[PDB]
Symmetry: T
Subunit: 106 residues, 12 copies
């Protein structure tokens, strides 16, 4: 999938978690998010197509996905323990990271 598609996936599954009333539904959504973010991690966005792999921007872009994957895994861990509310709140904290990266690079 390409970057735009990984984002759609990230976005839609954020909304699935927000409306979810059960752990499995949260778990499924976080699994999809984890896969979408790992794919995206190696992507180069349009605004950075002229930048070299070792630029500060790239670094920063790759760091933001590694940060996102960390958090998804943490919420996924809570989801697996049946802790819906806590998983949802962890998901909600994720938005901070989506937005920070969007400000710089979207």
């Amino acid at each position: 999938a390409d970057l735009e598609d990984n984002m759609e996936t990230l976005n839609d599954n954020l909304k699935v978690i927000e409306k979810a009333d059960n752990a499995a539904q949260v778990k499924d959504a976080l699994t999809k998010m984890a896969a979408a973010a790992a794919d995206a991690w190696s992507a180069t966005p349009p605004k950075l197509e002229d930048k070299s792999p070792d630029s500060p921007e790239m670094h920063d872009f790759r760091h933001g996905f590694w940060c996102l994957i960390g958090q998804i895994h943490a919420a996924l861990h809570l989801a697996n323990e049946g802790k819906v509310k806590e998983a949802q709140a962890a998901a909600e904290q994720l938005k901070t990271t989506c937005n920070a990266c969007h400000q710089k690079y979207r």
Copy 2:
């Protein structure tokens, strides 16, 4: 995934198919559509909530999904054979199936 979720997967992948520049992306999209449709197959839409599983409406709902799965498997056959423009055209024609069910039941 619920009915809305499956519908979102179907529509999202339709767009991926439409903008694709290669077979793998098309095959991937249709593979996800097949999965979503197979799941949606056994669902009850809001407007048929009061109907019996053995009703004309529910027979009709379920046959729409069987029809769609059929057309997706056909399109997937083409993507697999690397036939992008053709898989794309088959996707466009599936939309008649999407629309027909919607008109009756959305």
Copy 3:
């Protein structure tokens, strides 16, 4: 398994569902129902032996089982989400299909 055997599987596992107090028990019983139903789909019931595979009675018989597999997956979806009383509710609805087919063909 023969027709009688499959019926005995559908019937026991439906009792299992009826008295379960947990998702795993419902998940597992519904899975055994799907296989029994998928087997029975191809059978020829005593009362319809004098009949051709293209008769309206055999279309009816065969399609009784599609509708059953439909409702089984619906209930399995709810079971997978930990929703015991809702999977039980949806398992209750299967009986309308069991009853309709028995009325005409048992």
Copy 4:
């Protein structure tokens, strides 16, 4: 495989079953036939490209494959149980369905 290819699989394995003198030969041949019919179900024959996918013709065409698959599974079931002559006799009855569909859409 295209329609023609599945048909060759179908015909070719019908003959294998006719000359077969052991259960295994019949099992494999009926297993190849099942997969060829399954794939074939999603196809559109030349005589029906002009037709809409909802049309009476397409419904009747695809029903023809699910009825063949039904009979194939029954035959297979018999062969799993080692009953070679009975699987062969049920394979002969399959010809009805072959010829019915050929008479209409071939």
Copy 5:
């Protein structure tokens, strides 16, 4: 599955073996029985909750299942070798063990 459920599996498959006319039917039925007995071995019957897990009663109760499993494997071994009447005769001898345990702890 609880104790009662395994027993239903045990009894239900005993009957299948009695009316069976082919090796495969016997194989599967004896395979289901093995798994039901295996699961059953760890259970505590109502008549023995008062008892300590080391007690003579529990030892004799659990030994009853390993002896049944033994006979089940012997029967199965015969069925793998296609000897249908001999598997059926060994299945009849199983009744000894069924009734011995029922006489003491059921």
Copy 6:
């Protein structure tokens, strides 16, 4: 893993069970216990090093592990059915098995 190692796994997981707030943690713990006990089953404790594999002491050592595996499979059945308090209570009662072997052979 050696005997000490297996014993450490058993004790550690006992504590995890005791402090758990969810089924997945309990199921996981017992799954590890089952593995450790299955391994320890075939070991020779320090104080029986001079005894024969066919001795009353070694019969007795090995039957303790068979008994424990039995109780763990029972408890695991409960954790699987999401029954936390009950799986916890079954775990506490296993301790009688731990103690009895220890008194004789540690």
Copy 7:
């Protein structure tokens, strides 16, 4: 495999172990011994045919094999750790079980 066949497997592989100069050879021979022993466990030896499956002779026979599988795993544990002379040593000890059972029942 029948009783004679399984015995021939136990005997050859024990020679293999005896003359191996490497873990892999011992690992592999012990694995083949476990399966042969797991098969033989359900057999009825010529000398105990006139006997009921619940006799003390058949409890004895059956339990001869539990003890064998026990000692086999002990030696497999050492083999898995690359400890050739220690796995060979532990394989030497199996013979006490072979000998005891042969004394009473061969």
Copy 8:
């Protein structure tokens, strides 16, 4: 396994096939023989260590195994088809190849 070991597998399973009274016994025995011959093909017998790997002797030696494997597959094919007496007769013809090679290089 060394050459001697494969030979023991070969010989040992030849006898199993001679006394076999069911297809399964023959299948497994011929399957073990195939793997033993396959492994054996790469070995160098004592009588030929002095020889170059291109020599007439090594070519003829290794050809002897591919010819045995050929006959083994033919026998196996017959056994898969349940024809027990015919598999046994083809196994008897295998002796030709056994003895031809033994006469030259054993």
Copy 9:
């Protein structure tokens, strides 16, 4: 499959290759050819029945199939690289082997 069946597989799939316009179709047909050829390798053709498995005619027959499997893999290698016209070219070359063997033995 018997010799006739395998030949029918080689022949149909070679036509499939000849008229494919895509790698997947060629990949899949060549895979079915390898299995048919691997089966036929052990057969005995009518004309060589009066012959011993060590005759020059049977060495010739058997080695016809090694050479075929050789050329099949060559073409599968090109197919796997998406090279349709080159896999087709290499599939054309197989026929020299088909022809040579038919000249001497069909």
Copy 10:
């Protein structure tokens, strides 16, 4: 597993390596450590429950596990080469990292 449990796992397996006399035992222990550290990597310790995912502390916490995983993989690599002493010394170097993180965050 939660953080406290991953640590127990880390700790116990450190002691297994220290007393290990064979590569397999070291390998098993490092595999368990690798899994415990990857789980822990996404955890938030008690002392940092008020800190945001992008705090310097979190960063630092995640960096310490990535450093630990690096080292475990390096020792695991040595263990796989049969280099016990070297693996043990690599394990011992690990303690530097455990302790550094404990000073700040435990």
Copy 11:
């Protein structure tokens, strides 16, 4: 494999991509590179054998492989979309990273 070998692998597959005329060949080569780099990531080169795991050099060494793996995954993504030229150009950009690390540490 050790560091020197991972490098050979990296080097050879760089040359395979440079001469490749098809996506599969590129894909295969990048898969081999990805695996070689992940192995290498945990290695310690000769020039840094005296340095502690947390030295700036080690950090820097591990960062260079993580950067390389990122890029390989990006080229692998393009290769999977059938984009040969683009994959090759991404591979060529990789050399910047190989060389930078070689200047410091080789």
Copy 12:
């Protein structure tokens, strides 16, 4: 992988074998050699491009690879048995096979 590529794999792994200090490295190397040789088996070298697949030269080319695969499987047998010096010596003797084909066809 093409012929050159396979040859590079063969030579590279030969060197790994020659400099190895442990079994796992040797086993790994030979495993890669086996794969490369199995692939090269079905290739046509530059200097035989104008020859038929049924030519003495192509028979001869292919038999060289069968011979090499044979010797590699023998050497691999030794590495598996942890026999480093011996696997090394078997590798050195394979070089005669490499050279003989080269002299004729490189």
